[PDB]
Structure formats: C-alpha cells, structure tokens
Amino acid sequence: MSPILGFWKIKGLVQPTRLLLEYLEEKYEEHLYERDEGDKWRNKKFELGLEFPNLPYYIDGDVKLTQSMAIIRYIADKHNMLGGCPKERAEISMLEGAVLDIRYGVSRIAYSKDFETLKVDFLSKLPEMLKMFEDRLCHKTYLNGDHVTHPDFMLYDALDVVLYMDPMCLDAFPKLVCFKKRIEAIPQIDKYLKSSKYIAWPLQGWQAT
Amino acid sequence: MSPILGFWKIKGLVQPTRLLLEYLEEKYEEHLYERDEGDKWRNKKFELGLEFPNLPYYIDGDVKLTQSMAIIRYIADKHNMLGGCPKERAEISMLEGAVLDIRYGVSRIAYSKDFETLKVDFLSKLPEMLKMFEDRLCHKTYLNGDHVTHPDFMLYDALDVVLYMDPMCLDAFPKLVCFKKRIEAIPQIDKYLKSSKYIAWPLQGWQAT
Ligand SMILES: N[C@H](CCC(=O)N[C@@H](CS)C(=O)NCC(=O)O)C(=O)O
Numbered sequence: 314m315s316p317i318l319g320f321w322k323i324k325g326l327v328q329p330t331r332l333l334l335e336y337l338e339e340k341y342e343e344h345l346y347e348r349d350e351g352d353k354w355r356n357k358k359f360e361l362g363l364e365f366p367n368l369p370y371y372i373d374g375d376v377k378l379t380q381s382m383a384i385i386r387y388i389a390d391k392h393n394m395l396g397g398c399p400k401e402r403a404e405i406s407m408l409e410g411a412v413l414d415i416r417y418g419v420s421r422i423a424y425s426k427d428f429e430t431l432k433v434d435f436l437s438k439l440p441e442m443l444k445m446f447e448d449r450l451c452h453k454t455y456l457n458g459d460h461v462t463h464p465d466f467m468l469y470d471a472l473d474v475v476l477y478m479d480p481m482c483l484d485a486f487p488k489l490v491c492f493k494k495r496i497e498a499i500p501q502i503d504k505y506l507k508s509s510k511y512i513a514w515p516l517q518g519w520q521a522t
Numbered sequence: 523m524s525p526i527l528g529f530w531k532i533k534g535l536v537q538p539t540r541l542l543l544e545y546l547e548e549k550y551e552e553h554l555y556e557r558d559e560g561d562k563w564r565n566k567k568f569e570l571g572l573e574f575p576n577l578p579y580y581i582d583g584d585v586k587l588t589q590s591m592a593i594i595r596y597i598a599d600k601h602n603m604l605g606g607c608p609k610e611r612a613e614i615s616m617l618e619g620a621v622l623d624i625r626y627g628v629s630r631i632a633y634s635k636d637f638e639t640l641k642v643d644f645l646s647k648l649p650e651m652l653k654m655f656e657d658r659l660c661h662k663t664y665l666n667g668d669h670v671t672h673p674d675f676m677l678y679d680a681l682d683v684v685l686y687m688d689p690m691c692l693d694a695f696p697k698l699v700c701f702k703k704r705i706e707a708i709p710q711i712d713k714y715l716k717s718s719k720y721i722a723w724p725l726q727g728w729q730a731t
C-alpha cells in the first residue's frame with residue numbers, strides 16, 4: 314500500500330518529517346489523534362505490531378517504526394539523501410544532533426512551570442548555538458550544499474518554533490532569516506503551508522504551557 | 523595519526539562510545555577535563571576547528587565531529603555495523619532512539635531539584651519501556667541478533683545507570699539481567715572495566731544531584 318504515518322495532531326517531532334515527505338512529493342496517509350482521543354491511542358498502542366510502540370509511528374508495509382528520528386532518516390535513506398560515505402553521513406548526523414540541541418532545549422522546559430523563569434536561562438545560551446548555524450549557511454544555500462537534506466527541514470522547525478518565544482533572536486543572524494524564506498520558498502513547501510493538511514498549532518502537547 | 527576522543531571525565535553520553543571503541547580493539551587517545559578544568563575547555567572550545575564545538579568531540583584527522591550520537595555512529599559506520607539497507611539501518615536507529623528514551627529520561631531530571639520527587643514519576647513509566655527490550659532479547663542474544671551492534675552497548679549503559687537509582691527495576695525482567703552479564707562477559711569489555719582507563723563515577727556532571 315501507500316505509506317501510513319501516525320502521531321498526535323500537533324508539531325512536536327513529527328513536523329520535520331512532515332515537511333520532508335511533502336518536499337519529496339511522497340504519497341502518505343495520516344493518523345491524527347485529538348486532544349480528547351488520548352485513549353483512542355492507548356488501545357491500538359499494541360494492536361499495531363510495533364516492537365517499540367510510541368509516537369510517532371510509521372508503517373511502510375515493509376517496516377513498522379517507532380522513534381521519530383528513526384522515521385525521518387528512513388524516509389531519507391530511501392532517497393540516497395543519507396550520505397555517500399562514513400564521513401558525510403556522520404556530518405548530517407552532526408547537523409542532526411545540532412538542530413536537536415535547540416529543539417529539545419525548547420521542551421525540556423516548555424512543559425514545566427518556571428518557563429518564564431527558565432527561558433531566560435535558555436535565551437542566554439541560545440545565540441551561541443544559532444550562530445554556529447549562521448556560519449554554516451554563510452557560503453552555502455542549505456546546511457550541506459546546493460541540494461536539500463532533512464536537517465534543513467528540521468532547522469526550519471526549530472526556527473518557526475523559537476520565533477514564538479522571541480521574534481528577535483534572529484535579527485542579529487541574517488543568513489538564517491533567509492534560510493527560512495528560502496525554505497518557505499520551495500514550491501512543495503508552499504503548496505503545503507497554505508493548505509489544510511498543515512497544522513499551525515500547537516507546537517507541542519496541548520497540555521504544555 | 524591515531525583517533526583522538528575528547529569529552530569531560532565522567533560517563534554522560536560518551537561511555538556508550540567508549541565501550542564500543544574498546545569492543546573493536548581500536549586505537550585512541552583521550553582528552554579528559556577535570557571538575558576544575560572547566561575553563562581549560564572554554565579556551566580550546568574553538569581552537570580545534572569544529573564547525574559545531576561542544577562535548578564530546580572526535581578528531582579522525584579525516585573528520586572533526588561534535589554531537590555524541592554522530593560520533594558513535596561514525597565509529598560504527600567504519601565497520602559495516604550501521605546496516606545493510608534502509609530497513610535494517612532504520613531498525614538500529616529505532617533501537618537507538620529507544621535506549622535514548624531511558625537515558626535522557628534519566629537526566630531531564632537528575633540535574634533538577636525535585637529528583638526524589640520526579641524519579642517516582644519516572645519509575646512509574648520506566649518498566650513499560652524496559653519490558654519492550656525484554657521482549658526483544660527473548661529470542662535473541664543481542665538487540666539485533668548474534669553479532670553485537672552499538673545499541674547493545676548503549677543499553678548496557680542505561681542499565682548500569684538506572685541500577686544506582688533502584689537496584690530492583692530489573693528483577694521482574696530476567697533476560698535483561700543476563701544481557702548485562704553477557705556484555706560484561708566480552709573479553710574486551712572485561713579488560714577495560716577492570717583497568718585504569720575505566721571511569722566508575724560520576725554518571726553525569728559533577729554538579730548534578
Ligand atoms: N524520543 C521520542 C520518544 C517519544 C515521545 O517522547 N513521544 C510522545 C510525543 S510528545 C508520545 O506522547 N508518546 C507516546 C507514549 O508515551 O506512549 C522518539 O524518538 O519518538
């Protein structure tokens with residue numbers, strides 16, 4: 314059959330994956346659970362055949378995956394986009410785990426209570442990470458070269474997110490602010506963001522702060 | 523030259539990498555910073571040539587990597603151990619991101635203050651993850667088959683850790699308790715754990731709780 318991706322109905326960690334799939338004009342159906350269907354899940358949580366039930370999940374009829382990072386890499390690997398050799402592949406991973414630092418850093422807090430108190434403690438160190446990227450896209454169109462690569466989409470995420478936390482963190486960093494438009498300027502990505510399938514909110518679990 | 527790995531002087535996220543390297547009888551020198559040398563770092567933090575300075579780092583004279591996960595995968599990829607095809611590689615990733623859930627879950631708290639209060643909230647959900655593994659090693663010697671694979675070592679980590687947090691979480695889960703001995707029963711892994719290079723404490727940043 315044609316790919317079946319599932320996860321809640323938000324952005325969390327599936328979005329980067331959404332964008333990528335979309336970017337490759339891939340065919341896929343979505344299983345979305347609401348703010349109240351939190352049990353509709355609890356039921357099929359096993360019925361599916363995942364050796365590691367969790368969210369999001371992906372069934373290829375060729376595979377049954379859990380773990381968000383594993384899902385996106387797969388979709389990638391099925392397009393040569395993972396690498397060419399040890400050196401390059403470990404380079405995207407580096408880029409990968411780099412974009413992560415931001416994102417996870419965004420939730421290791423967002424759910425807690427001292428947000429307004431811990432975000433400050435984050436925002437102090439935020440720019441030191443962001444800039445690193447800046448220097449990357451200085452003489453490059455996308456984090457790796459002329460071709461795209463999932464990390465590009467994963468970054469487009471961290472950014473869209475942070476920019477709700479403080480729409481100024483990117484001024485000092487110009488090239489990044491172009492990377493965003495550059496991405497949002499890919500036909501594919503456009504057709505999506507302007508349609509119905511696009512989830513504009515929330516960024517995490519409805520429960521979050 | 524011969525590989526050069528660096529990180530603080532603890533376990534954190536480098537250990538799984540340590541074990542693996544050791545397992546492959548690889549040659550490598552270690553850059554270890556003490557509890558007070560927290561500035562000895564701050565200096566070379568850039569002097570090195572990492573496009574994404576952070577800890578741990580690895581210089582192959584072929585590459586300069588940051589991001590712990592990227593480092594271990596590399597060492598792996600340089601031994602066919604990463605996969606064979608899309609399906610299998612995304613399977614180790616799944617196993618990968620699975621072992622992660624435990625470990626990170628162990629620090630998203632360990633540093634905070636309500637440990638003794640949040641660990642309970644963790645330990646309630648711990649077994650639901652652990653068991654998943656249990657069912658994996660039921661009819662297998664290691665998380666993937668007869669051959670080893672880095673995730674095996676990453677798990678041997680989560681375990682050695684948790685078992686300081688509550689030495690009973692594994693009783694109900696027998697096969698895992700064998701996996702531990704099974705691992706600690708690899709000549710290589712033995713020669714290490716019983717030597718000087720082995721770091722027995724702490725599991726995280728000295729600062730931690
Ligand atoms: N580290 C994540 C683990 C998943 C996770 O944290 N999932 C959340 C999304 S906010 C979900 O609620 N999980 C389902 C569950 O707890 O059973 C991954 O690789 O997918």
Ligand SMILES: N[C@H](CCC(=O)N[C@@H](CS)C(=O)NCC(=O)O)C(=O)O
Nearest residue numbers: 410414534576577578589590591727
């Ligand atoms: N997600 C980690 C990022 C690193 C991290 O959290 N590193 C800690 C180890 S406890 C270190 O202190 N980082 C150095 C720094 O902040 O400059 C990775 O992939 O390596």
